[PDB]
């Protein structure tokens, strides 16, 4: 979506604990919080994705080399053609797979924060001015006992 580097501009350096969460200014702790579910489901999914690009390639034992005498040039060239063929296929398919699935990975974070942002705006409703930056001015600036409960997504009226 347009969440990452769209209307949420830049990012925060202060989250040593996770990849996604919140920043609250109310009457107490000015720190950042991690969403241990919005995040621990992404790492469960990304490490799953790397481990399958790695480990879905089973490969047998293979000695690539072949030796031909001076009256076997045709075989030599047929063999070289086979090696060039694989090189061209794996080089092209790898370079593009890296290229494409990197964009698929950066979108994954857009779709994640956009849903986390929509996990509170589609929950708080008209109890805050919906600032376009990705931030909400609270009508009853919740203390640390309440703000830690919006993380779980739990409010009243």
């Amino acid at each position: 979506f347009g969440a990452i580097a769209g209307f949420i501009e830049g990012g925060w350096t202060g989250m040593m604990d996770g990849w996604y969460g919140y920043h609250h200014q109310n009457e107490q702790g000015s720190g950042y919080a991690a969403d241990q579910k919005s995040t621990q489901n992404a790492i469960n999914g990304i490490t799953n994705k790397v481990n399958s690009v790695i480990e879905k390639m089973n490969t047998q034992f293979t000695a690539v080399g072949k030796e031909f005498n001076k009256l076997e040039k045709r075989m030599e060239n047929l063999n070289k053609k086979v090696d060039d063929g694989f090189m061209d296929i794996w080089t092209y398919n790898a370079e593009l797979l890296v290229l494409l699935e990197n964009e698929r990975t950066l979108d994954f974070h857009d779709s994640n924060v956009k849903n986390l942002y929509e996990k509170v705006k589609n929950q708080l409703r008209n109890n805050a001015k919906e600032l376009g930056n990705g931030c909400f001015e609270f009508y009853h600036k919740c203390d640390n006992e309440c703000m830690e409960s919006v993380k779980n997504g739990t409010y009243d009226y």
Partner: protein
Amino acid sequence: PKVRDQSGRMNYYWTLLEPGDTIIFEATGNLIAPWYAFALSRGPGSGIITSNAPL
């Protein structure tokens, strides 16, 4: 033409005598006879590496 200062030549040959089989050499001359041979069991199949890296 000479090679290693030799105008003569020695052609080298080989075969893998199977277990139980017999090989027979018969010559009137010119035979470079075997003296030592090798008892081996072939592995799954590999290749040659050409290098100077130490083992």
